[PDB]
């Protein structure tokens, strides 16, 4: 891994343990909204695509970096929206 190979490996595994751990004891009714929110969260891919795009030369790199950001932005935007709508199903009417 990166920025200190061991440093990073500790991060990788701790984050993985921590992630796994937060989700144990989730109820069934919350499965798919949980899926939507976690799907929304890996929406940060934009940030990575954004940096690829920001440093792109050669034009191929711009094209494919341009798609990267579109794809990444929809993942975050769309995922957010969808999660919110699922959560509205729990809500009463008056």
């Amino acid at each position: 891994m990166e920025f200190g190979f061991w440093s990073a490996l500790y991060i990788f595994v701790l984050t993985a343990f921590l992630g796994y751990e937060l989700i144990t004891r989730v109820p069934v009714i919350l499965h798919t909204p949980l899926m939507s929110g976690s799907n929304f969260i890996h929406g940060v891919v934009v940030v990575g695509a954004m940096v690829v795009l920001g440093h792109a030369e050669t034009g191929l790199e711009k094209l494919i970096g341009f798609l990267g950001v579109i794809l990444g932005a929809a993942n975050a935007a769309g995922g957010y929206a969808v999660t919110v709508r699922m959560l509205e199903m729990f809500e009463r009417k008056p």
Binding site: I29, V44, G54, K62, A73, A74, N75
Partner: protein, 262 residues
């Protein structure tokens, strides 16, 4: 470096707490809100990356993708929410691959182990991408719902995957720009092939599976390039996502492997 570090750090705390709260009944509604700020902070803070340019392309692409996507999510019937989760997921993975792909063809890697990480994330991303699209198609009735089977499929799938992995490793010795497009074609190709056999009724577990897959994709992508916001959030979701897939399968009184096959 240090204020971005500081921002991206607070972003992790916001995704962790958010994901934490999405998982409990009283606290679920706030969860998405907390993670929301996470995104905002992250998207702003990355403008200050040193050496940042092409800002017009950037503002275009953020604006284009975010709005068209928002537009769709809001109009769709509640009944089509599974495929929406699928298709936004697919594109998350496509992004993971694009990051990989660009860096791979500026060959901007000194450490060959990082290169390997990037390639792994590319492969996993590309699979999630087309994999999640086949999922969408099926739900939407654009394709046969039920398992699309054929003569010696098991073998052709393993074969493409094997061929993909192999020509993927190739990029470590020879990173020829021809090998790169081939690598991705094959990774996208294996994405589709993987999901043909998956029935429409099992699709919730396939989608949860691909969610784990793109999370992982982006965490790998984040470690390879030096990006903490991806490293954390990526694996956080990859790890939570694989557990989710187990629990969703269990709930559906069936197993993950079964879902994958016929």
């Amino acid at each position: 470096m240090d204020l971005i570090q500081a921002a991206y750090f607070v972003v992790a705390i916001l995704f962790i707490v958010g994901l934490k709260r999405m998982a409990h009944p009283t606290t679920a509604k706030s969860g998405i809100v907390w993670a929301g700020w996470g995104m905002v902070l992250a998207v702003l803070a990355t403008f200050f990356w040193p050496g940042m340019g092409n800002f017009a392309l950037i503002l275009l692409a953020l604006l284009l993708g975010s709005v068209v996507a928002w537009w769709a999510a809001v109009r769709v019937a509640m009944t089509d929410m599974p495929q929406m989760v699928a298709i936004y997921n697919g594109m998350g993975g496509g992004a993971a691959a694009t990051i990989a792909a660009v860096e791979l063809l500026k060959g901007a890697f000194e450490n060959t182990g990082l290169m390997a990480l990037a390639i792994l994330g590319g492969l996993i991303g590309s699979v999630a991408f087309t994999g999640s699209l086949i999922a969408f198609a099926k739900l939407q009735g654009i394709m046969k719902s039920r398992p699309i089977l054929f003569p010696g499929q098991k073998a052709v799938n393993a074969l493409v995957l094997a061929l993909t992995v192999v020509i993927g490793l190739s990029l470590l010795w020879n990173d020829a720009t021809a090998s790169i497009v081939l690598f991705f074609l094959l990774a996208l190709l294996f994405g589709v092939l993987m999901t043909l056999p998956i029935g429409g009724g099992d699709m919730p577990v396939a989608i949860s599976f691909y969610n784990a897959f793109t999370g992982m994709a982006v965490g790998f992508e984040g470690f390879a390039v030096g990006n903490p916001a991806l490293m954390v959030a990526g694996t956080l979701v990859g790890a939570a996502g694989t557990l989710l897939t187990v629990l969703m399968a269990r709930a559906m009184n069936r197993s993950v492997w079964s879902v994958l096959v016929g």
